[PDB]
């Protein structure tokens, strides 16, 4: 009765990622980023830019035919901060209000098992 997609919201620092894919993941759809919607290079993570991206990707998803979506929120991951960028929450809100259908929200930020090495040196980024 319903047709799903995969959202895979990536909320990084100094940028923001949005792109819906096929449930298998090989067929990608409606890849919209913060930078492609702005000219500040300050705002590619801004909640406003993320909201613009969310509305645009939502419209594209609606016209291609996918009605609902499964949320995988994912941060910078790897060895890095693992905290989501500011814009991601605003983008998720915007896509929820844009009209689409939502189910099965999860978190998929990648955490390592005591990884190799952080950059920055012993005495760390200092400023």
């Amino acid at each position: 009765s319903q047709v799903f997609g995969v959202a895979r919201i990536y909320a990084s620092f100094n940028d923001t990622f949005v792109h819906v894919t096929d449930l298998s993941g090989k067929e990608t759809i409606a890849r919209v980023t913060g930078g492609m919607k702005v000219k500040a290079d300050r705002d590619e993570s801004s909640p406003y830019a993320a909201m613009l991206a969310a509305q645009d990707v939502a419209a594209k998803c609606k016209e291609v035919g996918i009605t609902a979506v499964h949320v995988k929120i994912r941060a910078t991951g790897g060895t890095r901060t693992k905290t989501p960028g500011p814009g991601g929450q605003a983008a998720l809100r915007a896509l929820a209000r844009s009209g689409l259908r939502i189910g099965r929200i999860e978190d998929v930020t990648p955490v390592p098992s005591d990884s190799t090495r952080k950059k920055g040196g012993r005495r760390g980024r200092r400023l």
């Binding site: 901060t81 905290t83 189910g103 978190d107 005495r123």
Partner: protein
């Protein structure tokens, strides 16, 4: 003169404690010296919660959580409005809020 009975760490009977790395400034720091914090926050917000609930299939679905461990250098923790200072005798206080 000595400032701290523990010298500002938690090493008694070890000698070496295999340091870890600052989350913010990436500086190295021994584990016991760290200013370790736990962040337990729900995924979405307390503001968008109504929106997602009213627009959620499987009504009252899960609203899952998030758990992060945070490690800071001394200077990061101080400048991050975390543990700012306490007075001389107040320093001795151990209990958390």
């Amino acid at each position: 003169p000595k400032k701290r009975a523990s010298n500002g760490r938690n090493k008694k009977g070890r000698g070496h404690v295999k340091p870890v790395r600052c989350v913010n400034c990436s500086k190295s720091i021994p584990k016991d010296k760290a200013i370790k914090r736990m962040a337990i926050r729900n995924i979405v917000e307390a503001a968008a919660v109504r929106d997602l609930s009213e627009a959620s299939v499987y009504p009252e679905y899960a609203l899952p959580k998030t758990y992060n461990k945070l490690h800071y250098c001394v200077s990061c923790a101080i400048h991050a409005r975390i543990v700012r200072v306490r007075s001389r005798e107040d320093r001795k206080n151990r209990a958390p809020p």
